[PDB]
Design a protein around this nucleic acid. Sequence first.
DNA 1: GCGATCAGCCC
DNA 2: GTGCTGATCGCA
Length: 580
Amino acid sequence: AKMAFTLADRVTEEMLADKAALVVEVVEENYHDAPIVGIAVVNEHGRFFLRPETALADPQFVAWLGDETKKKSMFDSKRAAVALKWKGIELCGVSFDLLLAAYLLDPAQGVDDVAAAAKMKQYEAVRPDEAVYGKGAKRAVPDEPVLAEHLVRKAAAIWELERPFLDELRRNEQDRLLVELEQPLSSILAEMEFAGVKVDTKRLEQMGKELAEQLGTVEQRIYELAGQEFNINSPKQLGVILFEKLQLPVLKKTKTGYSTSADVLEKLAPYHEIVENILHYRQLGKLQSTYIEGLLKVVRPDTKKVHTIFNQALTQTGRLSSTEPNLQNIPIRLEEGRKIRQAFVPSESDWLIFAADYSQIELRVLAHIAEDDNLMEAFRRDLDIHTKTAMDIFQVSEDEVTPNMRRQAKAVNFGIVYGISDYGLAQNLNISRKEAAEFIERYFESFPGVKRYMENIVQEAKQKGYVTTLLHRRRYLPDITSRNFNVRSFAERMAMNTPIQGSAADIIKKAMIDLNARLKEERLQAHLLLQVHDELILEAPKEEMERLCRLVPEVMEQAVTLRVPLKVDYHYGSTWYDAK
DNA sequence: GCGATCAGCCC
DNA sequence: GTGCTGATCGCA
Ligand SMILES: Nc1ccn([C@H]2C[C@H](O)[C@@H](COP(=O)(O)OP(=O)(O)OP(=O)(O)O)O2)c(=O)n1
Ligand SMILES: OC[C@H]1O[C@@](CO)(O[C@H]2O[C@H](CO)[C@@H](O)[C@H](O)[C@H]2O)[C@@H](O)[C@@H]1O
Ligand SMILES: OC[C@H]1O[C@@](CO)(O[C@H]2O[C@H](CO)[C@@H](O)[C@H](O)[C@H]2O)[C@@H](O)[C@@H]1O
Ligand SMILES: [Mg+2]
């Protein structure tokens, strides 16, 4: 039964009520400078469809969009806000975002369109976007009659679903999480994405030619050491060369065949000179194809900026993710790849990059939630946590901690957070389970509070069916009762790790909101560019660095109040690389 | 063209 | 523990 609506040729006062479900459709996955194909509005007066060229040129409509007293309910308001920013139009007054609401109610549903959200409440009078637009090479905007009905049905669903979703969020004690954290954050991310990050393409291109030369030398050497040419980028062909022609021992296999992972190769290095060159080739090739060519592909030719898109409704822990490009995995550990960061520069002359990062926020959060006396005292003394853990599990004085002992203690600390397992640790430390388990038992002996938390949180997950973070983010764990050991164990690790990683996510999100407000009150030109899980990257006039050195760490350290202090380190320079 | 595999980068 | 990307491969 078709849905009734007015396919308007002009904008009327009736369409500008102070409460409405609004749809500003952007079909392209990457919404930066992308087309708005249609508009739909549903309010107390009816349902309307408006052509973009018409509405967006209407002075009254544009004013309505930018009036914060005129409330709008939408799905993925950031997409619409950014597409509008590229057209010089401000979107204000978004009081409800169905995507973010659905995300908070259950991140596991993977809601990515209105239909999926509506299905959560048995509402099915709307089609999935993929059904209307198709996918891949077949993707396409349908004729006006089909498009208009779809957009109106989406607006209609949003209009109907707002109350039931808000009611459930309220029952879950998550309504403030939506209204005071995620929605305000959505507007901040929109600003960051739109601003973009300036890239020194000349610098990137120069590095690219250096690697092209280095890869050519190592490539030929590999063929030389192998006695023939083959596709190194082919694990299949590489395996034949290594485990058949050169007879290297098979230490590990994959579902399909021989493993050629870096971890395995390192062990085979002693047997043949070719292995070292394969490792080098893998290093250079990764930088060339992924960080040089891949980054250059998404830089905008006119402005030389990259405009990432932060997916705010994807991770099961509350973290943000980044795409096109993913600016959350730019090399830094290895010096060769770290140089890539010299390519990210300030967008204005005489401006600099400022970066601030939380120091061990996950372990501090664990100290707080577990109320472990030993761990809390360690952070109150601001001790090197890995050295301290080594002293405790190995029963030695600070002076007796060797470099290897600290390395292994650090591995134990990472596991503890990321759901400890006498299997993942061993594999990571190149040791056995019995041994790894011995380290774990020693850890819990030194940190009994953490042991109690791990036991209690798993019990809570089983009883309630989910675990929660500091700001009430939730994650359901139905597999916690599984009779399959591996399936159940993974759920148990999630029960232990989500409150830690998730609370850390809550904190940095609140810090971003607090910082944006402080920068405005202070009348500073500085602004946020990126977020990388536990760090914030900004750019600003060189004349504002001194003020930022005091302001940013303070705002981040005071975002929330825990049983232990929060610590923030900071640096600034002419490029992202120098902000070290 | 498209999806399963493999690999490797970040926190 | 959470993510995103690129080169191969054989399939359609
Ligand atoms: N109705 C609610 C209540 C809480 N929360 C989430 C976000 C809040 O920041 C957090 C803590 O809620 P509290 O009830 O503890 O309120 P505050 O912690 O904000 O106030 P108080 O200092 O009284 O604890 O839980 C929410 O989303 N919706
Ligand atoms: O606008 C981002 C928002 O849209 C979703 C779908 O509702 O993801 C789409 O857009 C992303 C950005 O280009 C793509 O990575 C993704 O593949 C596409 O489906 C949400 O997941 C996201 O929160
Ligand atoms: O010269 C291209 C040609 O070489 C092969 C093997 O001889 O692959 C080599 O070059 C590719 C492009 O740089 C790499 O991806 C690959 O790892 C390297 O061995 C052929 O497959 C290709 O047609
Ligand atoms: Mg850090």
